[PDB]
Design a protein around this ligand. Sequence first.
Ligand code: SF4
Ligand SMILES: [Cl-]
Ligand code: NI
Ligand code: NI
Length: 417
Amino acid sequence: QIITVSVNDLDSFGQGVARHNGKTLFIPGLLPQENAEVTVTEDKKQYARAKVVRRLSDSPERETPRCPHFGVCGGCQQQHASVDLQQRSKSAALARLMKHDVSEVIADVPWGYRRRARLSLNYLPKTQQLQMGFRKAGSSDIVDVKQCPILAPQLEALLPKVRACLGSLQAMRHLGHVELVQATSGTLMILRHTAPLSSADREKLERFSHSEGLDLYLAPDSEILETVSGEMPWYDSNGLRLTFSPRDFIQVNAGVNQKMVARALEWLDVQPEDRVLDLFCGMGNFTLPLATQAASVVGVEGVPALVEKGQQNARLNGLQNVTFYHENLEEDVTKQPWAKNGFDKVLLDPARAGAAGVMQQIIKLEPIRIVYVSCNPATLARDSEALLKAGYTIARLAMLDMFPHTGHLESMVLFSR
Ligand code: SF4
Ligand SMILES: [Cl-]
Ligand code: NI
Ligand code: NI
């Protein structure tokens, strides 16, 4: 009960890392080189946890959190760390894993950067209140969100007005969640609800969205999406106009995404005669901009709805030299007819698990350059080993600061011969 410690390190996840009596201590709210009186409620084998009771000193990289919900909301972990410190700590971890220096950090605005949010809704029958916000750290309980400085300003401004509108509904107790999305075309609101809405409630929602200039969609279940108002949304990115369905996945950080795509294109050094392969291509985030430079592009993706949107967006942007295939990237696809003309360049952006079975497949293809975008540096590091064994070197490595103030650690690597 009560001991004095010094924090050595700031981990990926935003807790300070210290040692006491030779055991690792994880302390939330404490930064590298700060000292503190602390208490452990949680003592285990390989490590222990503790809370700050009194912080004795301050790092020069310490900032004042901009959000009043920070420390309680599960959404942010590191608002107390300056952006330089966040970037330095993540870059250091990445460099250590890859055994290679970080060439650059790709970043944009540290605040106001999220172009979509899903707000959970929960009804409290004992007090007849509606909660609207995000999950708490290590709990399913909702923090009522009144401000969210990471959210795009158009969306942040809507928070109290959405709250008062939903709080006015008869159907308040039967609401699931509400998604707010900002796109070049307009602002979108999607309300997921659990039973039929009355006409008085539909009218409130209609008048509200109509007053605020929002496109409104209602989702009575997991498949149905009714357009109350709006035309097909779209956003502009990297020289293209890209339509999307309000359910479909679009990137959270628009600015960092556009910079990532632009950089990946510079790294691939795409030539007019190049044939390019884009694995895990989604609806063509990288694929469509690659087609503006290359002789031809193939995208491969496992969701058919994304393959069809990629095709639609190619046509809309006058891209005749790109083909999208639906494939299962867990199986062997060097077999396929689209492989045989071969590839000069390959880009892949998989999920957390990585592309393990895929690395040998890429190697068989013998591209002169490969760009790999990862959200899990551990799997990136394992997959890199296979490319290094087959004669590729690390030409460039970047830390992508896609989710400021969180524990995410995204990265991008250029391999070449
Ligand atoms: S900025 Fe938003 S996500 Fe981050 S702690 Fe505040 S409410 Fe949660
Ligand atoms: Cl939905
Ligand atoms: Ni939803
Ligand atoms: Ni090097």
